[PDB]
From a paper:
Bacterial-induced MNGC formation requires bacterial motility and the Type VI Secretion System cluster 1 (T6SS1, also known as T6SS5), one of the six T6SSs [name] possesses. Hcp and VgrG (valine-glycine repeat protein G) are secreted substrates of T6SS that share homology with the bacteriophage tail and tail spike protein respectively, but they are also required for T6SS function. Hcp is required for both the assembly of a functional T6SS and the export of T6SS substrates by chaperoning the substrates, which includes itself. In this study, we have identified an extended loop region of [name] (Loop L2, 3) that shows a significant movement away from the main Hcp β-barrel domain as compared to other known Hcp structures.
To understand the structure and function relationship of [name] [name], the crystal structure of recombinant [name] was determined using the single wavelength anomalous diffraction method (SAD) with two molecules in the asymmetric unit. The model was refined to a final R-value of 0.248 (Rfree = 0.285) up to 2.7 Å resolution and has good stereo-chemical parameters. Each molecule of [name] consists of a β-barrel domain, with several loops predominantly on one end of the β-barrel and an α-helix (Ser69 – Lys78) located on one side of the β-barrel. Notably, residues Asp40 to Arg56 form an extended loop (Loop L2, 3) that protrudes away from the β-barrel and is well defined in the electron density map. In particular, the major extended loop (Loop L2, 3) between Asp40 and Arg56 of Hcp1BP is significantly shifted by 18–20 Å relative to its homologs. In the crystals, the asymmetric unit consists of two [name] molecules and the hexameric rings could be generated by a 6-fold symmetry with 12 molecules forming a two ring assembly. This stacking of hexameric rings could form the tube-like assembly with an outer diameter of 80 Å and an inner diameter of 40 Å. The symmetry related molecules of the hexameric ring show that the extended loop region of [name] could potentially act as a key contact point between two hexameric rings. Most of them are hydrogen bond contacts involving the residues Gln46 to Thr50 from both interacting monomers of the stacked hexameric rings. AUC analysis showed that at 2 mg/mL, wildtype [name] demonstrated two peaks corresponding to hexamers and dodecamers (black histogram) whereas Hcp1Q46AE47A exhibited a single peak that corresponded to hexamers (red histogram).
Residue numbers in the entry:
A (entry chain A), B (entry chain A), C (entry chain A), D (entry chain A), E (entry chain A), I (entry chain A): 7 to 18, 32 to 89, 105 to 123, 141 to 154, 160 to 168
F (entry chain B), G (entry chain B), H (entry chain B), J (entry chain B), K (entry chain B), L (entry chain B): 3 to 20, 35 to 89, 107 to 120, 144 to 168
The structure:
């Protein structure tokens, strides 16, 4: 994960479960992006970014860069932290996104 | 899986769970196809088609050919990717279809 | 299973889970049959009848004979295939019925 | 189980799970019996009574005697079969009742 | 459990799971007690009190004393039996209460 | 019904009439071993609790054999011994099941 | 009730009155072995925590035997020893269960 | 269909026509061991209960082999022996599966 | 846990699962805090604070200090106990909060 | 509270104040074996992560014993050793639990 | 796609193009043991059933090795042997995975 | 972030920056055994798949050790060896975790 917040700037352990959903029946006049839901859930331990992600989650801070190499592979736009579980004997950060790219390279709802 | 997109053309690991449902009570004036839901879920690893399927899923790209040999057996029409889970220690691609053929050979809602 | 379709005629591996439900409170003016739901779910492998059952399921083809010996025991009327899951390392065919007979011999909503 | 139907007369393997529920808040003007739900679920194999219970279930036949010794202990009134699952490698018959007696001896909504 | 019914008087095996819930958002004009739900579930075998609790459950009989020592610790007011599961190879009696005391000693919605 | 149950001392009066049948046979028979000694038959009965409970529980600890064991639904079992009770699992030798309708009976290691 | 519990030193005062009963007997009795030594009786009690908790937890570590063990519901147990506590599983020898109504009692390996 | 089932004494009449197929082969073959002896084939059939139940249950205890074993869906099995029945798991040697459409058949350890 | 009630003052075993949720779509005119839900669930045994937390839960007593060191790390404002499960062979206290701080140090909806 | 935790070198400063208690005693005591050596006490603590995490994780690998171990809720433990941590399971010898109210304490294998 | 699959006799025609990849390496390598012999690679493929099913099932019983094994998504596998099929789990030696985009390939125990 | 990962030949370029940490220590240390040899440390990383996948999968089969292993969240690990990958479980010796805020680090079996 290379991650940078709108506010907190750059934030410094292998996530990750990528979930994407699209209804078979598209609402009349609805954009595919609005009908779809993209969510990637990252699991990792707890350290210096934990308070940074937890602040972003409560303040609705946008991720300025969200790039997952798996220079990378997954790149996500309009990233918003939507859920987090911190616990003990790990945390699980669930992100919501709009545009995405996987690298043949695929991309949808991307923005220049 | 022999697969080809409307847009991406031909896309290059053993799925697969075929689910089909039909309500016992058919709505007055409703076609059996509209009441039914056909879904096949394919599990496979992750490689050159992964970004291709993931782009199709976000762009609502129609599969032009969807043929599962199991020259084949399962052939599906109006194929639309409706869901996908990519994760680690695989992905799971869930397709929605209208017409279908299994090969005695059976076929319903097929189109020339 | 000795099975014959309305259309496909006779169709050629030990199912089976029989489920039947009846509400304690019967709606005013409602027939017991309409309040009840009879469902038998058969699990078996996949072969020459698989496409035949899968076609019946999509075309809403009525089973003309549905007799389960367990010359038999279970016999079912107005049989309609309502669900099917085909998968790998089997299929599961879920039938809906009205009249039934088990053989003391019991029978309800049967028709000559 | 000593059991006798309204219609089938006397019917000839250790059930049994007794479930009874009562809401803490009783509806204004509602009798405790109407708010409550008594259900006993009997599991047993499959034999001469199986078609008899299965006929009762579809025909809404009232049990004339329902006495479970565990000369007995559990005795139930207004017994109606509400659910049944027959299956293989057993059946499970779920009864609904009004009045009941367990034997100190307890009894509620009983009738002479 | 030292227990005495409103009606059955005194009733003669280590429960017990105490559950209490309170919504974070309190309805305007609502008392905390009415928003909350207190439930203690006792598991024990089956014997002379079994028919006594089962009668109380069907007759909505109030427990006059409900004291759980764990001279005791848990004491509960306005105790009403709300659920019970009797079964075999135990019963589970689920009580609902208003006032409570645990013994530092805590107490809420108690009454002299 | 449930079970008609008589005991080889003593006595038999558990209230009448009062399940999961398991039978195993190794695929390879030990050289010189009779199938009966190689096989294992156990029927597990579920029920609530009363007058038979202490009678079953005394039998289990005293290694008291049954003398009649028939659970009609008809099953009949020989050399029945209680091997486990969570408050009932019986172990048997000879066995007979007989269906209805038909009068077909299967039986093995039965004794004159 | 719960348990009336006295201890063989020391003492007995855990507040009165304060479960899953398991008993096992191997189908084949070791040659020359008494059933009591071959069998295993354990009753597992669930409860909250107070004045008896340290008393139970001290007994478990000190291998302190009980002297009265009766959990009335009536069960009575001899040579009761605490073998496991996740904050309670007792192991016993002799046992008696007695039902109500009736006055029927089963008992094995009881001692004068 | 279900199964056409004939038995090597006696007899064959379980009502016709009446599943999970498992086959295992260790990756490393024991030196001097034939694959057939190293492998294990078992097909587990689920079904309700009737005229074949006592016939299957008698066969299982008597170590009665089958002589025809074909479950058409076509599967055919040799040296079929019932090894387990929870009221059916068969163990086999030779096997053949044949698909439709096509006429393709796979077969191993089959016998003339 | 260093904890102090509004009323009970200071209250005297390693929780803890921190859950925080934020909807991707923020209601028009809604503050992020009102859309979000912060919940931390602490598991611990049962002792002198148990009645104190249980009283707070029923009386809707505000925690004046809620500081979890893991001088600390987690600090929570407007803490309200919303749920509790006390049981046996532990309790689980579920808190709801507004402002929070984890220590880089993150903080949201905090108040001087 | 959580835990007050001091360590036998070094040091003790994990921020204060910072669970599932398991204790087992075999029913049969090995001849000549002291109960303490036969028994096993382990308390499993769940918590998030901070300044104590590296301190706990260093202790676990260095086989560093604790010198104060008290988790107040009061539990006190001797010879405390960390045996497992999934990012905490401690193993102990002597133990004391003390309830409130009352001042009742149980204790075993405690040391002067 | 699925798999392109050729077999070392005979033959290869299972319809093209037709999963969970597991690889294990003990942390401590046996003295004098090559990693390949110490490791275990198995890929489990899920799919429906047709013309390849009898071909896979014949291969599994005949210990028929594959000669081409490539599942493109690209995976390529050597010494592929079917070890288990519930109606497919393959065991392999050499392996290659190659990603897209990039042209990066990892490979071990591959053979010229 | 994820992981910064360098390898001891060859090479290191899996795209940067790219989990469940388990550590076990037996309560009783084998006589003459160093804690490090008695303990077992494994961190399990979950992630999607790309350029590092073949690099991780080649390393696992070739018993290729890592030379930098740091997963920042900061964890640092020595003698890191891949032991299992379902398409990642690493085994390590020395370890360091360092929290933020604070600058507190725990470390064991680290090497100069």
């Amino acid at each position: 994960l290379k991650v940078k917040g709108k506010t907190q700037g750059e934030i410094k352990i292998l996530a990750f479960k990528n979930d994407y959903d699209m209804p078979a029946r598209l609402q009349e006049g609805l954009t595919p992006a609005a009908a779809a839901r993209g969510t990637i859930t990252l699991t990792k331990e707890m350290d210096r970014s934990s308070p940074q992600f937890l602040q972003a989650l409560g303040k609705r801070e946008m991720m300025e860069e969200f790039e997952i190499t798996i220079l990378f592979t997954y790149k996500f736009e309009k990233v918003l932290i939507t859920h987090m579980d911190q616990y003990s004997p790990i945390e699980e950060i669930k992100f919501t996104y709009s545009g995405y790219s996987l690298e043949i390279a695929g991309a949808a709802n991307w923005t220049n």
